[PDB]
């Protein structure tokens, strides 16, 4: 299973608290329990735009996680809606990468963002 330090890192991602709670709600009949956890994280944090694990994720006001580059490309195309639910984020949507999420994902999947 996951470790205390992993739990501490997850607790820091305060803007995905509800989601992480569901992830944590998820013992397997095959392989190891930590593998089940990893499977569930990967599924939960898929970017809808590029179909990869989100990298430099933006956690939108409407509580969806999209890569910054994917959201940036959409805005440059003059599409200011959430790719996941089409809530109107608006022009000049002030974004910051969700660093706590990025830190968790980089710890669980080191190097997944190589060249991203
Ligand atoms: Zn993406
Ligand atoms: Zn949304």
Measure the CA–CA gap between 66 and 47, rounded to whole angstroms: 5
Those residues whose C-beta lies under 8 Å from the C-beta of residue 85, and which sit 6 or more positions away, are 62, 64
Rg (CA), the chain: 15
Tell me the CATH number at 91: 3.30.40.10
Give distance in angstroms: CA of 69 to centre of ligand 1: 7
Give distance in angstroms: CA of 29 to centre of ligand 1: 32
Give distance in angstroms: CA of 47 to centre of ligand 1: 5
Of 35, 102, 116, 21, the closest CA to residue 65 belongs to 102
Of 78, 76, 74, 80, the closest CA to residue 61 belongs to 80
Residue 32 lies in domain: 1-116
**Measuring CA to CA, how many Å separate 12 from each of 9, 31, 50?**
5, 28, 26
DSSP-assigned states of every residue in 69-84: HHHHHHHHTT--B-TT
Give distance in angstroms: CA of 71 to centre of ligand 1: 8
- Tokens encoding 8: 């501490």
Q: HSE on the CB side for 34, CA within 13 Å?
A: 7
Overall resolution, Å? 1.8
Give distance in angstroms: CA of 68 to centre of ligand 1: 7
- Determination approach: X-ray
């Amino acid at each position: 299973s996951l470790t205390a330090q992993q739990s501490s890192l997850i607790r820091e991602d305060k803007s995905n608290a509800k989601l992480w709670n569901e992830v944590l709600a998820s013992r397997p009949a095959s392989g190891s329990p930590f593998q089940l956890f990893l499977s569930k994280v990967e599924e939960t944090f898929q970017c809808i735009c590029c179909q990869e694990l989100v990298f430099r994720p933006i956690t939108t006001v409407c509580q969806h996680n999209v890569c910054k580059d994917c959201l940036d490309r959409s805005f440059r195309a003059q599409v200011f809606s959430c790719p996941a639910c089409r809530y109107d984020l608006g022009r000049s949507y002030a974004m910051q990468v969700n660093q706590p999420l990025q830190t968790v994902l980089n710890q669980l999947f080191p190097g997944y963002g190589n060249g991203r």
